């Protein structure tokens, strides 16, 4: 739906499927003080 | 062909016309003991010689010389010396301490010592030299002495016309030294030093510029004041870098630093006294024993180095110093004894003058520029040479002092 | 980090702190890409010119930390390393080209609100976000400013620092330095006529340069803090190892040694 794995979990371990989503932010509909500053720069 | 660097004493007979006889540290790895006792004698000579030289110059004058090159040169006269001339040579250069065999074939073992040093510095660094003895053509030189000279000293005594062409002979000598060093060392012999009474002249010049093992980046270089001994400021180009270096703060706050050249076998050692203690004081209170002791105690660590880039071209007559140290008969027309140099007939031969000139160039390079990364490696200490410091260039394993000097004024 | 700010709690749950076991000292930063692998910079472990060659047994990592010195009970986790892998053609002899290393933990670490892996880019994500002008986030406990004097323990932050920087054009990077650049690096940082500033500094190497995907809203590590000349110097930029361009080697180490 959004993220497609690349490494084999056998030798890579767990966590790739959920990589990139911070427990205290994205996963809680929260943003940090300056991530907006990053999107703005995206043309 | 005869490879002096591999050949042994017996391979080729080259005994002197006369010999002399006078009434701890561990030996380095892969080293011939005779070459080693020779290297230790030069250090004892360098100490006494540097002292006379310093007490004859201005505290604000730079100094740079190669005691090794001087000892080698006078070992060539020793080859044909006899009686009091020979004795004096032995005592002044500290040859009267080493063993019999080493003493008798000293010229050979100096070649051996030099072979080893030449191939180590030229691996990456710059170590060129131009040495020679010049005699008036009216004389008849000993051919056996010539063959030995060319084999062990690189060239045989060169006949020139001092009696009829002193200036032209003067120019030929300067042009010849300049040729052999690619324009690096010029005017070794000043005008007036050679006239129609000149019979024999010694000339030994040496140049160096080693590729730093870890070089300074030019973008970190800037003007900064340098405080000379008199008391005046001075705008100098200060280089800077951080890296791992052998360092040590010794007695009375004097700092010791070793900056190795590519290869690690040849390094530069800086002695920086506290702003309070004068360089002149360290120059008098330092001996080979204490220096070796400091060098033994150095620890490797991350530190910053602030060093001025400089140039030292020091040339001078060796005559006065050496006489002052006791080498008298060699320079005297009446008393000199150098039979071995001349053929049979009757010689009134003696050394007219001896000239030395050494050139040291130090800058950022000493091919891709290197960078080291952003990991945490804090500078434990910082070595800022913004005031007079001593310089030594040595061969690590053998501890052979190749060059020694003082940077008393780097600026313009 | 020069000109950054105290990161917020859990703002960078993949940040890893790399220590030399004994004597203990903070060497570099690093990132968590799974529950058993940590990515970092190669010169943080291997640098022959300084006789630096750290191996599994000389190392250790602390994960999920915020404060630089205070022990954060029940939040941070220490882990030893089973093995470390340095890119075979990492060029320590000149420009640190391919400055990358992988590290396998003794045992997998447990995730939490404080420990969480970051994503590695795919060709597409790397092609749309890796554009000049676009900003990424650098983080670490490195120094707060450049220094030229003895500086053990000087200029250090009390907590994780963070700063956002814009990727620069390859033409500008190349002309800002005389160090032969390669396609395996990319530089970030503000130009002189931009007024604002900031950069990574001594101690930030190995740390991650991340970007948030506007596509799936996930964070991706596009770079690894690698090198610079000084810190935040006018007309100079910080350099980072191009992670995606080395993904082939990362995969080669993983499904060959994580067996
Ligand atoms: C000995 O000598 C010594 C010295 O000496 C001196 O001298 C001195 C001496 O000394 C000794 C001394 O002594 C002491 C002295 O002597 C002396 C003596 O004593 C003192 C004396 O005695 C006492 C003597 O004397 C004598 C005399 O004489 S006089 O003079 O003195 O005089 C005589 O005389 S006469 O004349 O006579 O004769 C005599 O004398 C004697 C006599 O008779 C008897 C007698 O008679 C009787 C006499 O007597 C005397 C007396 O006295 C006695 C005296 O006394 S006093 O009182 O007066 O005196 C009187 O009494 C009375 O007198 C009598 C009589 O006299 S009259 O004259 O008259 O006769 O006398 C008697 C007397 O004594 O004197 O006789 C005598 C005795 O004798 S007797 O005999 O018996 O003894 O003398 C003598 C003389 O003089 O001599 O002294 C001397 C002198 O001194 S002064 O000072 O002076 O001078 C000398 O001097 C002289 C000297 O000098 C001369 C010497 O020294 C010298 O010498 C010596 C010797 O020599 C011989 C030396 O030593 C030496 O040394 C040496 C060295 O050392 C240092 C040594 O050696 C050794 O050791 C060493 C060391 O060890 C430690 C070593 O080294 C080492 O080595 C090693 C090895 O090497 C070989 C190394 O190692 C290293 O390195 C190596 C290498 O190298 C090179 C390595 O290895 C290697 O490895 C490698 C690797 O492996 C791992 C390999 O390679 C291979 O394999 C590999 C792997 O494979 S596998 O299969 O497994 O895999 C591979 O690789 C691979 O590859 C692949 C491919 O590639 S390529 O390129 O090719 O194709 C890959 O893959 C990848 O890739 C890529 C990339 O690419 S690139 O490049 O481009 O980058 C890829 O691809 C991709 O990408 C690309 C690119 O891109 S971009 O864009 O980026 O650009 C692309 O392309 S393009 O074009 O396009 O671009 C591509 O594309 S394409 O289309 O093309 O395809 C792409 O592709 S893709 O597909 O990818 O697209 C890739 O991919 S990625 O991404 O991943 O990258 C990839 O894949 S793929 O498939 O794909 O392709 C890979 O990679 S990975 O990643 O895969 O992995 C790779 O892999 S890796 O890993 O590698 O990377 C490769 O290639 C293929 C292959 O092939 C090559 C190899 O192979 C196998 C291997 O090899 C092996 C190694 O490992 C590593 C390392 O480590 C280890 C090492 O290191 C460095 C080294 O180290 C160093 C060596 O070798 C071993 C050894 O050897 C054996 C040696 O030996 C030991 C030695 O020897 C000894 C020295 O030193 C030198 C010199 O100097 C010093
Ligand atoms: C031209 O230049 C050359 C180069 O130096 C000179 O050549 C040297 O000349 C000296 C003597 O003037 C030579 O020394 C003498 O060598 C003799 C060696 O013979 C044997 O010695 C022992 C024998 O027991 C053997 O081991 C050896 O293999 C030889 O077979 C010695 O016997 C001589 O003894 C001397 O004793 C006293 C010193 O204590 C002297 O005062 C005596 O006069 C006596 O000579 C001496 O040691 C030397 O070997 C020569 N070397 C070379 C390369 O040939 C020329 O002298 C010089 N000539 C001119 C015109 O200047
Ligand atoms: C030191 O001396 C050497 C030679 O003794 C100098 O090198 C010589 O440099 C000249 C030009 O400066 C060369 O001239 C050319 O000679 C060839 C003959 O081989 C001739 O065909 C050409 O028309 C030209 O005249 C000369 O070859 C070269 N000598 C050699 C062969 O090495 C050197 O310049 C001197 N160094 C200094 C400046 O003291
Ligand atoms: C940098 O240094 C490490 C450590 O090397 C030491 O000496 C070696 C001879 C070996 O005995 C090591 O265990 C010591 O710690 C190097 O690691 C070893 O390197 C050798 C040869 O390169 C290799 O055979 C070993 O497998 C390595 N470690 C082990 C398991 O012994 C490392 O390779 C060195 N690399 C560089 C760039 O110098
Ligand atoms: C040198 O002079 C001394 C003084 O008399 C003499 O005894 C000695 O034999 C001389 N040496 C030689 C052989 O030249």
Task: Decide if A11 and C10 are in contact by the 8 Å CB cutoff.
Answer: no
Dist CA C64 CA C221 (whole Å): 17
The answer to whether B98 and B90 are in contact (CB under 8 A) is no
Dist CA B247 CA B267 (whole Å): 13
The answer to whether B64 and B312 are in contact (CB under 8 A) is yes
Helix (H) or strand (E) holding C32: strand C25-32
Dist CA B245 CA B258 (whole Å): 6
Ligand 5, from B18, B83, B346: best to mutate by most atoms within 8 Å of Cβ? B83
Q: What domains are defined for chain C? A: 1-12+118-244 (2.40.10.10), 13-117+245-257 (2.40.10.10)
**B264 secondary structure, DSSP code:** S
**Is C158 near ligand 4, meaning CB less than 6 Å away?**
no
Say whether B10 counts as a known binding-site residue: no
The answer to whether B49 and B41 are in contact (CB under 8 A) is no
- Residue B274's contacts (CB-CB under 8 Å, 6 or more residues apart) are B252, B253, B254
Dist CA B308 CA B360 (whole Å): 13
Pick from A7, A15, A42: which is nearest to C214 by CB?
Answer: A42
Spell out the domain ranges in chain B.
Answer: 9-211+308-364, 212-307+367-410
CB atoms within 10 A of CB C91: 18
Dist CA B384 CA C185 (whole Å): 34
- State the residue range of the domain holding A36: 1-43
- What are C203's strand-pairing partners? none
Tokens found for residue B110? 């100096």
Q: What is the CATH number of domain B9-211+308-364?
A: 3.30.497.10
Dist CA B110 CA B38 (whole Å): 8
Ligand 1, from C242, C248, C250, C254: best to mutate by most atoms within 8 Å of Cβ? C248
Tokens found for residue B201? 């002249």
Tokens found for residue B78? 């020793």
Helix (H) or strand (E) holding B145: helix B143-152
Pick from C28, C50, C225: which is nearest to B244 by CB?
Answer: C50
Say whether B184 counts as a known binding-site residue: no
Dist CA B138 CA C98 (whole Å): 70
Tokens found for residue B396? 């690590």
Is it the case that chain B and chain C have 3 or more CB pairs lying under 8 Å apart? yes
DSSP track, C190-224: --GGG----B--TT-TT-EEEEE-TTT--EEEEEE
Report CA dihedral (C113, C116, C119, C120) to the nearest 10 degrees. Answer: 160
Tell me the shortest Cα–Cα distance from B310 to chain C, in angstroms: 21
Pick the CATH number of B212-307+367-410 from 2.170.190.11, 2.30.39.10, 3.40.50.300, 1.10.3720.10: 2.30.39.10
Say whether B36 counts as a known binding-site residue: yes
Tell me the shortest Cα–Cα distance from C153 to chain A, in angstroms: 29
Please determine whether the domains at B9-211+308-364 and B212-307+367-410 fall in the same fold group of CATH.
no
- What are C28's strand-pairing partners? C18
Dist CA B327 CA B313 (whole Å): 26
Dist CA B237 CA B9 (whole Å): 50
Q: For residue A14, give the CATH number of its domain.
A: 4.10.140.10
The answer to whether B371 and C95 are in contact (CB under 8 A) is yes
C-alpha B86 to ligand 5 mean position (Å)? 11
- What are C212's strand-pairing partners? C219
Pick from C111, C164, C257: which is nearest to A34 by CB?
Answer: C164
Please choose, from the candidates C211, C257, C213, C230, the residue with its C-alpha nearest in 3D space to the C-alpha of residue C31.
C211
The ligand whose atoms approach the alpha carbon of B10 most closely is: 1
Dist CA B87 CA B102 (whole Å): 16
Instruction: Please list, residue by residue across C93-107, b when 16 or more beta carbons sit within 10 angstroms of its beta carbon and e when fewer do.
Output: eebbbbbbbbbbbee
Q: Which residues line ligand 5 (CB under 6 A)?
A: B 82-83, 337, 339
Chain C contacts in chain A segment 2-41 (CB below 8 A): 2-4, 6-8, 10-16, 18-26, 32-35, 37-39, 41
In chain A, the number of structural domains is 1
Please choose, from the candidates B398, B410, B209, the residue with its C-alpha nearest in 3D space to the C-alpha of residue B306.
B410
Residues of A in contact with C123 (CB under 8 A): none
Is the peptide bond prior to C23 cis by the omega test (within 30 degrees of 0)?
yes
């Amino acid at each position: 739906s959004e993220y497609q794995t690349f490494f084999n979990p056998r030798t890579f371990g767990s966590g790739e499927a959920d990589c990139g989503l911070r427990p205290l932010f994205e996963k809680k509909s929260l943003e940090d003080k300056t991530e907006r500053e990053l999107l703005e720069s995206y043309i | 062909p005869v490879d002096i660097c591999t050949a042994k004493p017996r391979d080729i007979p080259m005994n002197p016309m006369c010999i002399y006889r006078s009434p701890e540290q561990k030996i380095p790895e892969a080293t011939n003991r005779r070459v080693w006792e020779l290297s230790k004698a030069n250090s004892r000579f360098a100490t006494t010689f540097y002292q006379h030289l310093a007490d004859s110059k201005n505290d604000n004058d730079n100094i740079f010389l190669s005691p090794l090159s001087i000892s080698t040169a006078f070992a060539m006269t020793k080859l044909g010396a006899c009686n009091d001339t020979l004795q004096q040579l032995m005592e002044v250069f500290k040859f009267d301490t080493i063993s019999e065999k080493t003493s008798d074939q000293i010229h050979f073992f100096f070649a051996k010592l030099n072979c080893r040093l030449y191939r180590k510095a030229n691996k990456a660094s710059k170590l060129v030299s131009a040495n020679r003895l010049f005699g008036d053509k009216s004389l008849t030189f000993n051919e056996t002495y010539q063959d030995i000279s060319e084999l062990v000293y690189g060239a045989k005594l060169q006949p020139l016309d001092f009696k009829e062409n002193a200036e032209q002979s003067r120019a030929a000598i300067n042009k010849w030294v300049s040729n052999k060093t690619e324009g690096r060392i010029t005017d070794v012999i000043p005008s007036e030093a050679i006239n129609e009474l000149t019979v024999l002249v010694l000339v030994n010049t040496i140049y160096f510029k080693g590729l730093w093992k870890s070089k300074f980046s030019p973008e970190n270089t800037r003007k900064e004041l340098f405080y000379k001994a008199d008391g005046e400021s001075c705008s100098a180009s200060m280089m800077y870098q951080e890296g791992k270096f052998r360092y040590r703060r010794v007695a009375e706050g004097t700092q010791v630093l070793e900056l190795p050249f590519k290869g690690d076998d040849i390094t530069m050692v800086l002695i920086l006294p506290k702003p309070e203690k004068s360089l002149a004081k360290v120059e008098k209170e330092l001996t080979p024993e204490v220096l070796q002791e400091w060098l033994d105690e150095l620890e490797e660590m991350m530190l910053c180095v602030h060093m001025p880039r400089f140039r030292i071209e020091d040339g001078f007559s060796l005559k006065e110093q050496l006489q002052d140290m006791g080498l008298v008969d060699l320079f005297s027309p009446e008393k000199s004894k150098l039979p071995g140099i001349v053929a049979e007939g009757r010689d009134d031969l003696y050394v007219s003058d001896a000239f030395h000139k050494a050139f040291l160039e130090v800058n950022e390079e000493g091919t891709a520029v290197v960078i080291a990364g952003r990991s945490l490696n804090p500078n434990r200490v910082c070595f800022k040479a913004n005031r007079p410091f001593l310089v030594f260039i040595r061969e690590v394993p053998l501890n052979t002092i190749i060059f020694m000097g003082r940077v008393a004024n780097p600026c313009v | 980090i020069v000109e950054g700010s105290d990161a917020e709690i859990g703002m960078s749950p993949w940040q890893v702190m790399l220590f030399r076991k004994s004597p203990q000292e903070l060497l570099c930063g690093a990132s968590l890409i799974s529950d058993r692998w940590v990515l970092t910079a190669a010169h943080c472990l291997l640098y022959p010119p300084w006789d630096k060659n750290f191996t599994e047994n000389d190392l250790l990592v602390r994960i999920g930390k915020h404060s630089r010195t205070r022990y954060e009970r029940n939040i941070e986790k220490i882990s030893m390393l089973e093995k470390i892998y340095i890119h075979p053609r990492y060029n320590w002899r000149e420009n640190l080209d391919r400055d990358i290393a992988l590290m396998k933990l003794k045992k997998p670490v447990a995730f939490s609100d404080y420990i969480h892996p970051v994503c590695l880019p795919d060709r597409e994500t790397a092609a749309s976000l890796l554009q000049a002008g676009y900003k990424g986030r650098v983080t670490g406990w490195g120094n707060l400013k450049e220094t030229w004097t003895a500086n053990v323990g000087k200029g250090q932050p009390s907590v994780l620092q963070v700063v956002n920087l814009p990727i620069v054009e390859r033409p500008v990077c190349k002309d800002s330095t005389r160090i032969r650049i390669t396609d395996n690096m990319f530089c970030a940082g503000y130009k002189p006529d931009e007024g604002k500033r900031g950069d990574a500094c001594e101690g930030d190497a190995g740390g991650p340069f991340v970007m948030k995907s506007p596509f799936n809203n996930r964070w991706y590590q596009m770079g690894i803090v690698s090198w610079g000349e000084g810190c935040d110097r006018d007309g100079k930029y910080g350099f980072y190892t191009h992670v995606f361009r080395l993904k082939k080697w990362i995969q080669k180490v993983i499904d060959q040694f994580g067996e």
